[PDB]
Every structure is written in C-alpha cells, then in structure tokens.
C-alpha cells in the first residue's frame, strides 16, 4: 500500500509516521474480513521515487498474508488422492472382467477431467504452472498410467497369461509406493518452501 503526495515534490511536502514505524499502521483485532488468507503482520517503509516531474516521498506499507490450505485440500487434494485410489483399486479385480475395469478406468479419467476443470476455474488465469497444477498433472499421469497399464494387462491376456499376471502383481504394489513417495516429496518441498 504505497501512498505519497501528488503535485508536491520532496522539497515541498514530506511524509512521516506519527508514531514509531512498527506501531503506526495498526490493524484491529476483529478487523479481518479474510476468508482465504491469514494476516501475519504489517511492515512499513519510506522511500523516494523519481518521476518525470521530480522526486516524491512515498510511504509503503506491506501486509503479509499466508494462504489457508483448508479449502483447496477438500476441493482438489482430497478428490485427487481419492480418485487415484479409485484408479488403483482396479488392480485387485480379476483379469477376466474387462468391461468392469474398463469403465472403472475411463470414469476415473472422467472424474479427473471434471476435477481439473472445476479446480482450474478458481485460480485466476495465470500463464505458468502452480503447485496445484503439478499435483493435478501428476495425479492425472498416475490415473492414465493405471488405465494404460490395465490396457496392457488385458492385451497380454489370451496370449501370455503368466506375463499379464506378473505385471499385474508388480503394478499392484508399485503404484502405491510411487504415489506415496511423490506425495512425500511434493508436500515436503511445498510446505518447507
């Protein structure tokens, strides 16, 4: 929150805080209409800007905010994890029921697409990748990898049953390990950042 003087240069009007700078901007106790953030404190400063008409005193005030994750957890991170679990539960069904696991996989993909659409519409239209975008991308990768792996398992049926059994037993336990390590590294790098 930068404020200064319009029409009065530094040699005419100067600003200053009336009390100690740490105690000048005072936020009330019940004065918080924030729903998504958390006000941590204030921070004042004073400087000079060099414009086309002269130098002007500018008083700066920074309010430090920290976003609360409780909404986005239930909105995106709980549906992504639950949808990934719903994709991974298909590996426990037998290889002889192919339409069942097929509609499992494809409707899990459908859930991921509508989830990504509903979760992308909250954040403004930025032109880079955020952490939620990376999470949705990796979860989509896991779900799609589960479905393509199932397609591979089904394709290997009626020609090589031992290979399909081996790769379905290996992918019945390799998927939770990779998903858990990804969760650990992601939350560790984005909570300690």
């Amino acid at each position, epitope marked *: 929150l930068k404020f200064g003087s319009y029409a009065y240069t530094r040699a005419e009007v*100067v600003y*200053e*805080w009336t009390r*100690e*700078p*740490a*105690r000048s901007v005072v936020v009330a106790e019940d004065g918080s209409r924030l729903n998504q953030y958390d006000l941590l404190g204030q*921070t*004042v*400063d*004073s*400087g000079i800007v060099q414009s086309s008409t002269g130098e002007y005193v500018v008083m700066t005030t920074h309010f430090h905010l920290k976003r609360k994750i409780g909404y986005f957890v239930i909105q995106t991170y709980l549906p992504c994890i639950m949808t990934v679990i719903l994709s991974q539960v298909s590996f426990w069904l037998n290889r002889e029921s192919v339409p069942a696991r097929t509609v499992f996989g494809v409707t899990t993909v459908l859930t991921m697409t509508t989830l990504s659409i509903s979760a992308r519409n909250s954040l403004p239209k930025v032109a880079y990748a955020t952490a939620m975008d990376w999470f949705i991308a990796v979860c989509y990768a896991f779900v799609f990898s589960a479905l393509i792996e199932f397609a591979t398992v089904n394709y290997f049926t009626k020609s090589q049953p031992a290979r399909a059994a081996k790769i379905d037993r290996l992918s019945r336990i390799a998927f939770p390990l990779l998903f858990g390590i990804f969760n650990l590294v992601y939350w560790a790098t984005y909570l300690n950042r």
Partner: antibody, heavy 117, light 106 residues
Framework: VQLQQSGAELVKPGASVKLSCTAS????????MYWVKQRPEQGLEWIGR????????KYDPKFQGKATITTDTFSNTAYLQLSSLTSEDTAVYYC???????????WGQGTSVTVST | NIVMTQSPKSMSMSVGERVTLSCKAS??????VSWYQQKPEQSPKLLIY???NRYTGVPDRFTGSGSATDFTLTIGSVQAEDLADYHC????????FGAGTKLELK
C-alpha cells in the same frame, strides 16, 4: 536547533537525581524527545522517549519503573528523573530529538553522573 | 527488542582509503537505520539519516546502503578527522543502537 543540558552530578547511591534538557530554536511539542545513556567506552543505550504534545511516554523494558521522563511545555524543557540509582549507572546522559527519517538529528551536550561515597 | 550488531568492533586504517562498516539487524528494520559519529569527549553527530540519505552538513564521502536487514556505511577519501566512534541505530521500533566501531589511524 540547539539542546542545552545541565552540569554534571555527583550523588550517593540510593538517592534520586533530576536532569534537565532545555531546547532553544524550536517548540518541543512538534517532535519527540529522547534520552540516551552512554557508559564509559561502550555503546549507546536508549532510556525512553516522551511525546510532549500529548504526554505519552515509553520506556525501555530494562528501565521501566527506574527512570521517569516528564516535560515542561511552558519553558521548553524535558526532564529525566532516576528514582533509585545503584553503583553501576555512572554514565553520560544525552538528550536528543527526533529528526527527518526518525533519526536523532540534534543531541544535547551530556551530563556525566557519578555515584560514590 | 530489535538488536543491531555492528562489525568490526575495532579497526585500524591509513589515510586516503575506502573503508566499510556494517550493521546487521535481527528483525526487519525497513530504511530507518541511522549512522551517528561521535568524536572523543563529545556528543554524537547524525551523519546518515535513513538508509542512504546524507544529513545537512555532512561531506560527500559518507554514503549508506540499506536493505531489510543488512546495512553498510562506506567512506571514500578518509581524512584525519574520522578518528572517532560510529554507531548504527534503528528507528523502525523503539530505538536500539549498535555496539559501535572505533576507527583508528595506522
């Protein structure tokens, strides 16, 4: 413009002292007035400040209750009273005023109190 | 209570050379760090008010450099009257000063 302090004091540990700082060249109701102490061959230490236009005073937590700062507007004077001073606060006491970017631009001349028997 | 740590505690230097003094704050002090000069048996004189602003009557060889926590005071062509103590003090909160730096001639 100028701050003038009183002379040195030679008091006994356990009594009270009153130092004065008279301002010439400005009205003390426009700025703050600071009291600083400096021990022999050491760094400065802020005692407290007073807002003469209001009367609000603030003190250092290690000086709350010991020192008390008052002001006299009619003669443009700032007073520092130490209540019960022991055998270690034998320092030089400076009187300062706040400046442009909240700095102490004008300082007094120093009052070197000495406690002994 | 914001503590200001000044370095070095004591130094020696010859005439006509650049010298740099440093002040480090524990907490955030925006640009409200001031540098005072105190000759022996005299009251301190304000040299630099705010971060990088010279006071009226200070030569053009003193200049300050500010940040959120790290502050420097650099002198250029140093003459023979800068044999004094230099204190840094913050004014973002209730003022606290640094320990001081004693410049000497050698």
């Amino acid at each position: 413009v100028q701050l003038q302090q009183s002379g040195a004091e030679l008091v006994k540990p356990g009594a009270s002292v009153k130092l004065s700082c008279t301002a010439s060249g400005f009205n003390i109701k426009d700025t703050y007035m600071y009291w600083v102490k400096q021990r022999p061959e050491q760094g400065l230490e802020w005692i407290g400040r007073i807002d003469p236009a209001n009367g609000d005073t603030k003190y250092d937590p290690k000086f709350q209750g010991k020192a008390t700062i008052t002001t006299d507007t009619f003669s443009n004077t700032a007073y520092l009273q130490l209540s019960s001073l022991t055998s270690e606060d034998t320092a030089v006491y400076y009187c300062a005023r706040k400046g442009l970017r909240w700095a102490m631009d004008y300082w007094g001349q120093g009052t070197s109190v000495t406690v002994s028997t | 209570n914001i503590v200001m740590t000044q370095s070095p505690k004591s130094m020696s230097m010859s005439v006509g050379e650049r010298v740099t003094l440093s002040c480090k704050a524990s907490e955030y002090v925006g640009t409200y760090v001031s540098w005072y000069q105190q000759k022996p048996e005299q009251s301190p004189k304000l040299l630099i008010y705010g971060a990088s602003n010279r006071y009226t009557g200070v030569p053009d060889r003193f200049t300050g450099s500010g940040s959120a926590t790290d502050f420097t005071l650099t002198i250029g062509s140093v003459q023979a009257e800068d044999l004094a103590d230099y204190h840094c003090g913050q004014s973002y909160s209730y003022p606290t000063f640094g320990a001081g730096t004693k410049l000497e001639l050698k």
